[PDB]
Every structure is written in C-alpha cells, then in structure tokens.
Design a protein around this nucleic acid. Structure first.
Lengths: 309, 316, 309, 316
DNA sequence: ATAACTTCGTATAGCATACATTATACGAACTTAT
DNA sequence: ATAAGTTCGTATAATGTATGCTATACGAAGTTAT
DNA sequence: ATAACTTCGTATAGCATACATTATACGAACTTAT
DNA sequence: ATAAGTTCGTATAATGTATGCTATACGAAGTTAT
C-alpha cells in the first residue's frame, strides 16, 4: 500500500510525462469505472478481473465501439501499471471477454468510421458561393479551407500557425514552417491577412476569432480552438445542405479531417502513388491512407483489371 | 483441481472468444479420445502422455492423415493448456511420436491434397452457358461464382455478406465490405471490388430475388423448387450449400464424379481462391498484389499455389 | 535421474523422429565433447555452462567455422532438451561466448563458402570432350551432368530417380516425377539407358555403378551413393584442370551443388527473375539464391545503374 | 552480491561479445554518474531510482540533448540488467522523468540533427577537381569518397576493408566483401559493387599506394607529408581520419566553417549515406532497392531521409 | 617545424524491434462583446 | 438575445515512442617520419 | 413425392508465426569384381 | 593391384517443421414449401 502511494506520488510529480488529453481520458475512464463500481457494489481500486470483465460487457451493452472499450481497458491498464499493480489485461477472464466482444460486435456489423471527404468538387463549390463575399467570416473561412485542403495539416496544427511562420517561394507561393500553398490559395490567405490585420504583429496566430460585427481580433497568446475549426467545416456543410441528419450519428457533415481525407482521395484519382500520398499528409502507417482511398476505381485491385481485360 | 474447473468454466463462459469450429473439433476429438480411453480402460482427463502417444499411433494405424493426427493432438494440447495443465506435447513421448508419425507417413508417400482450381476459363465457360438462363437459381449461382472468383473470399465470408455491405464506386462497380475473415477480425475490415461484368451478374440476382427488400438481408439465400427466393436476415445460405453450387457447376460441365471416394474430384469452396491466385501469376501480377487480392499477409503460401525455363536456355 | 532415464528411453523408442544424418551428427558431437571432457577432467552429462564455454573456445582455437561451433552447441542443446535438462544456450556464459566467437571469427576474415559454379561454359566444354566417347563411364557421367544442370536437383534426389519415374512431354522431352529436360539432355539420358540396360526393369534407379570393364550393373534396391555423384563432379574437374590445389581447402573442384549454383547464375545472366530462379531449384529462402548470383553484373544494384547513367 | 560480482565478471570476461563503443560509453556514463553521486554524497552502484531521476534532471539542466540523456539512462539500465539487478527504468520515478524530459525539450523546440547530404552533384564536382591531381593523398581521398557514395558503407566498414576483400565481376567492376556492419555480423556478409568509374578511382589508388603488396593490407592507409603511403595489416586508417577527408573536401569547395560551434556545417562520415538515399528516391528507385543499397531491413528510416504535389492539382 | 595523422573523451545519431499514448468528434454548457 | 466563440466530457480515430545496443561528431592533445 | 436445402459428424486443409533439423563436403577406410 | 565404388566420421551449408487456432470437404440424415 505504501508502494502504491509512492507510485501515485510519482505520477503526480511527473505529471508532464503525459499530455493533457491523455489525463482527461484517464480521468474520464476512472470516473465511468468508479460510478459503475459503486452502483454494482464493486471495489474500484485494485480492480478485480471479474469486475473489469463485467464492466467491459456493460460498455458493450451500452452500445459502445470496440475501440472505445479498448480505451477504457487501456486506461485501466495504465492506472494499474503506474500504481505497480497487476494489469487487468494480463488476466484470463478479461483477455477472453475482450476477444469475445471483438468478434460479436463485428458480426453485428459495427463499422470503423472516418471523416466525410471534403474534395475538389466541394472546394470549387464552396469557392463558387463564398469568393465574391465581402464578409470577414467568409473570407477567413475560405482561407482556412484552402490551407486545410492544400496542406492536409491537422486542426491543432493549423491553429498553431503564426504569421511569422509564413514565408514565400517561387512565383510568390506561401510556405508554412511547422508546407507550400498554391497560387490561388496563397491569394485567399493574403486577402484574410489584409482584412484581419494579423500581420501587424509577427507573433500573432494566422487565424483568429471574428465577432458578430464582422471585426477580427488577432492574438499572440490565444489560438482559435480546434472546436472552432471543426465549426467552420460544419457550417460550410450546412450552407450547402442545411441541417444534418436526425439522431446523433457521426460524420454527417464535414469535420476536422475532412480535407485530409479528401485531398488524399483526389491525389489517388490523379494516379498519384501511395508512397507520395503518404508524404503529403505526414502518414507513416499505410492502413490509414488506404482506408481513405479504398472505394476508388483506381484502387479496385488486380482481379478487376484481369477480368476487365 | 479447483483452478482447473475454474479455468474450464472461464473458457466455456466466454466460448465466443473462439470459433464455433474450434469448439466443434474439441468435442469431436474429446469424443474420440474418450472412446479410445474406454476401450483401453484409461483416464481421459488429465490425459497421460504415454496414453496420448498410444492413441496417436492408433490414429496412424487407422490410416488417418498426418494433419488429422495433428488436429487430435492440438485439441488435446489446447484443452490442457487452457485448463492450466501441462500439454501432452510437453512430454517427449508425445512430441517425438508426432515427428515419427509425420516422417513415416510422408516417407510412405502421403501428401496433403489441394482443391481443384476454378480459373478464368472455367468462369468464362460457366458464364457462357448459364448467363442465358432465366431461372432464379442459375442467376444466384452464377453471381456467387462471380463473387468467389473476383474476390477470392472464403465461402463463410460470402455467406455472411448482407445487402447493406454493398456500396458503389465512381464508375458503377460494386464494393463488398468484409469485416470478418478466417485471419482477420476488424471493424475496419476490407472492401472487395467487383468488375463491371461481375457487378451485373450480382445486379441481376438482387432484382429477381428481392433480397434488397431489407438491407439486413443476407445477399445469398435459398431458392426453392419453384424458383422463388427465400431472403432472410437471421439465416444464411449454408456454406454446405455454397459447396454444392461448386460441385453442381462442375457436374454440369464434366458429369458425375468417379466412385473412388477421393476428395477434390469436383470444384469445392476453395476452388476459386486457388484458381484466381494462379491466373494472377500467369498474367504476371506482382506478389504483393496477389497477397492483397486474397488477403494473405505472408509471401510463402501465395508462392506455394503457383508451381506448375531451364529448357529454353539450353537451346540450341 | 529417473526422469532422464525415461527421457532417454523415449528417444531410443521414437528413434525415427529424426533422420539417420541427424543421429550421426548428434553422435559425432557427443563423441567430440566427451573426449574433450575426459582430457580436461570435466563432467560430460549434465553439461555445465562453464565447461560448455571452454569447449566452444577450444573449437574456435581448433580453427572451426562459426557454423560448425553452432552445430556442436545445437546438438548439445538437443541432447539436453530431450533429456529434460537445461540447455547450455540458456546460460549467460555460453550466450556471451558464442556472441564473442561470432564477432571475432568474422573480423579474422572467415568466409561462408559455396560450391564452385558448373555453368554453360563448363557443360559445353565437358560435352566437347566426352560426347564422341564410346566409354560407358563417360556416357553415364555426361547424362548425370545434364540432369544436374537442367533440373537443379540435389544429389540425394538424383540418386533416388527410377526409370519408372521418367515419362515424356512435348517433342519427346523427358519428365521426371519427384522436372522437364531439354531435347539435347533427353538425348544424353536416352543413350545411357540403352548402353546401361536400366529400362529392362522399371523399378531400377536411372543411375547405377559402372565397373572397370565398362559394364553397368542396374539395381532396384541399391542406389548410386551421393559420394559417387560428387565423385563424377570432381573427376570431370580433374579431366580439364588436373589435380586440385594443395592443403585441403573446400570447393576447389566441382561438387554436388556446383550445377545448382551454376544454373542459377546462368539464369541471372539471362535476366531471369529471382522469383522464378527460386522456383527452378525449389528454393524458399532468397538469401541462398542471391548468394549464388551476388557477384554478377546483372545484380550490381541501383547505385551502379545511377552512377553509370 | 556474490552473483552480482559473478555476472559482472562474466560480462567483462566476454567483453568482445559487445562493441568496443558500448564499453566506451558505459565507462563514460559511469564516470559521469559517479561524479554526480560524489557531489551529492550518494551510492553510485546499486543505483537508487530517486537518485538516477535527479541525475537525469541534472543532465537536462546542463542543456544536453534528449538522446544524450537517453544514453546515460540506457548505460545505467544495461549495467544493472546484466548485473542481475532491477534497472533504474523498472521504477516509475525514472521512466516517468524520462518521458517528461523528452516532451519538455521537444516542446521547447529541440530537434535531432542530421548529417549534411553528400550527393551525386557534390561527387561530380569533387571528382572534376581532384581527378587531375597526381598527389597520393588526393587519389586516396577521391577513391574513398567514391566508395562512400557508391556503397553507402559506414566509415568503420570502409576502414576495415582489406585488399583480399576485393574481387571482380564479368564486366570488370570491383566488388567489396563486407562481413561486419553496424547491424549485421555474418560470415556470409554482403558484396558491394562499384561502378566502372569508381572502380577506376580505386584502381588508381591501389597502383600509387602499393597496398596490394600484401592481400592482408587494409585498402586505406595514412599518407604522410611527402605523399608516400604507409600500408598496414595491423592498423587501419582511423574513422576519425575518414571524417577529416569529408571535412577537408567540404573545406576545399566551400571554405572554413562558421564559428557557431554547430554540428554538421561540413560533410561528415554519414554524409554519403544520406545523400545517396536521396539521389535514389529522386531518380525514382524503388524502396526495396534503396533498402538493399544501404543495407536497411526496415522501410521507416529509409522513408524518413526523403522528405524534401498538392499544388500541381490545384492549377488552374 | 610540420603535415597528417592517432587517441581519446564527451556528445549525440542510427537502427531495429516492441509497445500505448494522444489526437479528433461533437453535443453541450459557459463566456464575452455586439 | 445572440453570434461566435471557449471549455468540457466522453466517444472514437490515428499516431506515436521505449528499448538496447552500436555507431558517428568533433575538439583537443599527443606522435612520428620526414 | 420432391428439390433444394439444413444440420451434423468425422476428416483434413489453411495460415501465420516461431523455431532446429537434415543436407552436402570430402578424406579416408573398406569392399567387390575385373 | 586396382577401378570404382560404398561406408564412415566430421566439417559446414541449406532447408525445413511445430504451434494454435480457424477453416473447408463431404456423405448422410433430417426438413419444408411446394
């Protein structure tokens, strides 16, 4: 018990060993697991395999994804290893049930999802409606969509971009120190800069909030949240399609990764090689890229080519 | 003895962690081992290494294949390992007898057998004949064989396909989502593309069957004597019936099989996998691409299917 | 000790678990190790790690190849596992010394060797001298060299060939149930058959001994030893080059694998693909094939192509 | 304490099981850890997790790179694991502080550095200048750089090449046998082919040096002030001197380096590896072929060297 | 004397293998200025 | 009020790094045949 | 009644991962018939 | 004697198989909507 107290003091002292997002997930899983334990009269710390098994089945019965059940077990495993206790995973009951849960959920037709593609057809269509707009929100949102599509940067990465992070290459194409922009997108990002006044301080983040009057507020210390960048994708989708489908299902509108998904797919349509599609978005594992471009005629495989010839 | 009974019931309680086929073979081997034990008055649980050894020699003497004998050993090993007991194979008596049985049978000329290939030419011939049939059963069967050859999917994988699993490409080609295979259990799964021609074969079957009247319906269903399809969301076309399609198709073209009792005299469930791999190699498809087509993660088995140059060099 | 006696009775009872060649090697290593032990006052059964270490170093000091030292350790490991005792490999001293021996022997310039290639230049040259010969030995030896080169079969495999194992394909090319022969080689194998009279019994092995009178002796029960097939390769080399180099070094003349080595190399010169070079000789691991064709201009690699263009 | 001392001497006795460089770094880290312990009055063997943790924070505060701090931890871990003792990293204090030190340094913008590429153009330029020199040292240096670029071998591998290691192809191209690399210790080893041009550069160096007067001579040797080569079979041209060749060659073309104290302002021992990988990718060489060229067994590092398309699609 | 090394000590990269952290999704509650 | 965010908690997708050697990077001091 | 299945039991293949057996080399001793 | 082997022991090169599921192969018996 003193070994566990020490281990827990270790954890708090070296807090910064893990990111904020990891801690939030860790705390969220412990909350959920302790609530279940209380309601079901189980001990939450030293977690028993039989109780961890029951809780995993409860999570399945709640209709949670296999990958979610794995996060819960993964966090429980982490709390126990960092407390010097045995991990629930290393028990026969839990490894069997997890294996069981995996097979059953797949046969019920559970699908791993991914962002609705934001491609060229969409970016030309959005440009068609927003490019003649004098509205500061529209000018900011169009510049963001160009960067997202052109760079394939994640939303946290785009929110971090500073004015001083932007340089210039051949023909006057912008370059962002973390990717090079096209002439048309460089132009869009240029217009936003003028109407926003972000360049008036080099340490300012390129993207900032725009209030209801239409007036932008640059900041060197506050970034536009990733939630607001998802907001831009959603609102852009509503513009063209109106409110999204009923009952909270995921990826019914565009979101953060939509442009990454989309740019990958448009590269594949252009017969661009996977090894270089991977380099464009900074991918290292191919199972993610191939999952974005899997349903394209260019990716149909060798049997389809043999049968059609 | 307390833990052993607990370990057993832990496995039984989460039986779905394993294939229904594993359980089927465990019980079949247990039946057969228990029978051998009764005949020789022996304790069948905790199995004794010397007894298991006698039993494997007994199976050899019954003329059973090396792979059958390995299955019986493997089931016994699993039952003991998951009981928390030493495996029969943990003893020299059992592990040495198994090597010996293998080498003696091989030396006497036992070879593992392989499914009769179902290739592009066979598919072309079958399609030239059956595509003019208006019968619902012929339309199903030709669409099945199209899928089998195009996708290299196993019969169980084809049987689990539901209508909602089918989507479309830009160009109008069907894609089938496959979540569970013999080697993969994933929510990501895989997408299997159909050629334009095979797409149409499948299209024709959907129309005449009415399986799309419910997206949860399995793509393939039984067709009764009066050509009326019986779609279901709870029952699949058995893998046994899919095998019958291959056998019936072979019968249509080549007539009835010998009387010799051999396996693989007609096409079977695995026939389109072995055939498609071979057609790909002949067309000079790359090995990574063949592997991707059949969902293999290992260069060796793919290489083994394609074994029919030095002559050409010597001429002169 | 009763557990060890049992384990040893297990071994003798299920003798046939291992081939004769494995047993011969096992017995040869135990002989060598027990002799060393006696001379050095060590206990040979239950082998101690410290003694196994000393013996491994002794084998190195005797000038033995790294792969030979591994056989000795591998057999010692096998005797101990099949006796239910701890393997010497699983001890810290032995794993360190073996790792040490590996590094030292390589830096002293120890080379893994392989059969001197018997190629087309050699097979045409041999044909040039032996094809107009009425001598029964010459006729048998030329037929053997054609099969060895053309099939790439190992010597044990060629010795097993029966007359009833040979059929025929297109143009009258022979086929051997275990590979197809060329027209010129099929002709050579045909001539041997006539002068030998092996076909006069289907169960006779294709190749049989030829005594000093020049008269062949067919047999359905006795094969020509692999040692005699190596003899054919050596004697053929002496014909052209005379006696081999001084001091017993290996592969100074042709041997059993010479034709396998050679046919692989000639396929590579013909730009034949490795995946199909592998199929010709029944290879499954590429490290062996690539080792036969490594020093060929066709195999020089991508840097040589880049630099020369 | 008896076993610990035995395990230590077992490792010392078979020290050749490890690289001379591993031992060098163990002792250097031990020196530095022992010094830190003396300053804070601490027991340095069996190392205490809390002390090791303080020490790693101390290294961070000295401005040392994340990879340096990892080396100090790694040496301490090895000393304890091979002693038969628990590693400092077996404790949460040490394993958590190491993550923290990494993340804090990275967040503050620390990046690992990479050798300045030495590419085909550089080789072409160097060769256009030095090929007209009759000096023995220039002839050696150009042959060295030819080998470095052509083969992608590491400096230590080049330094170990003996004359007897060189053979020839059909077409007259040199092949170098390499038995020991940073990642491979084999009696089979590898053969490294030289282009016709590089072959000639090496040919010229052999002639003027007289290294072939003994097949056991190392290919490369020192050349003293009067241009006379000093071949040896017992002494190699130090890897430090090979580095000097790269630095001197860079100096010849670009002048003296800054005063900034940075690493990688001139070419170094690893410069031709990074350069050749990049030239290959640019020429559209396949990834398996690049891997085979440098002797890599893993697709990831090869991919990392070549990172300089979406623009081209957007035009318009 | 000097060129051209060798030797060495601290600093840090390469490399392959093994294993878990950290990101986005999104409804919703909260905050601020218009 | 409300646009237009930010902060939050939880659901789920997507990257990452730890490990155990073995190596190079480079200034500085020492060496030897000219 | 029957086609067209389903269900089932014994037999055996597929498949991927992990790990050691079995072949040739060759000097030499031994055997047999010429 | 000796050609021309075979058998042997040991040195070293080169293939192989064991493991733990999960699947198909197929005859036979049982079922149900015609």
């Amino acid at each position: 018990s003193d070994e566990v107290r020490k281990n827990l003091m270790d954890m708090f002292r070296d807090r910064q060993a893990f990111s904020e997002h990891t801690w939030k997930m860790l705390l969220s899983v412990c909350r959920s697991w302790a609530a279940w334990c209380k309601l079901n009269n189980r001990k939450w710390f030293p977690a028993e395999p039989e109780d961890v098994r029951d809780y995993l089945l409860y999570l399945q019965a709640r209709g949670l994804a296999v990958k979610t059940i794995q996060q819960h077990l993964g966090q429980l495993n982490m709390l126990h290893r960092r407390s010097g206790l045995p991990r629930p995973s290393d028990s026969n009951a839990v490894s069997l049930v997890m294996r069981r849960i995996r097979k059953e959920n797949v046969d019920a037709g559970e699908r791993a999802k991914q962002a609705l593609a934001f491609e060229r057809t969409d970016f030309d269509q959005v440009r068609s409606l927003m490019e003649n707009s004098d509205r500061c929100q529209d000018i900011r949102n169009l510049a963001f969509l160009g960067i997202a599509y052109n760079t394939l940067l994640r939303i946290a990465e785009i929110a971090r971009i500073r004015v001083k992070d932007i340089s210039r290459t051949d023909g006057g194409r912008m370059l962002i120190h973390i990717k090079a922009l096209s002439l048309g997108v460089t132009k869009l990002v240029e217009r936003w800069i003028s109407v926003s006044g972000v360049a008036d301080d080099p340490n300012n983040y390129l993207f900032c909030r725009v209030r209801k009057n239409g007036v932008a507020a640059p900041s060197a210390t506050s970034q536009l949240s990733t939630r607001a960048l998802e907001g831009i994708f959603e609102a852009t989708h509503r513009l063209i399609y109106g409110a999204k489908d009923d009952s909270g299902q995921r990826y019914l509108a565009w979101s953060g990764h939509s442009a990454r998904v989309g740019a990958a797919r448009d590269m594949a349509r252009a017969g661009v090689s996977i090894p270089e599609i991977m380099q464009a978005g900074g991918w290292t594992n191919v199972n993610i890229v191939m999952n974005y471009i899997r349903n394209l005629d260019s990716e149909t495989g060798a049997m389809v080519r043999l049968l059609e010839d």
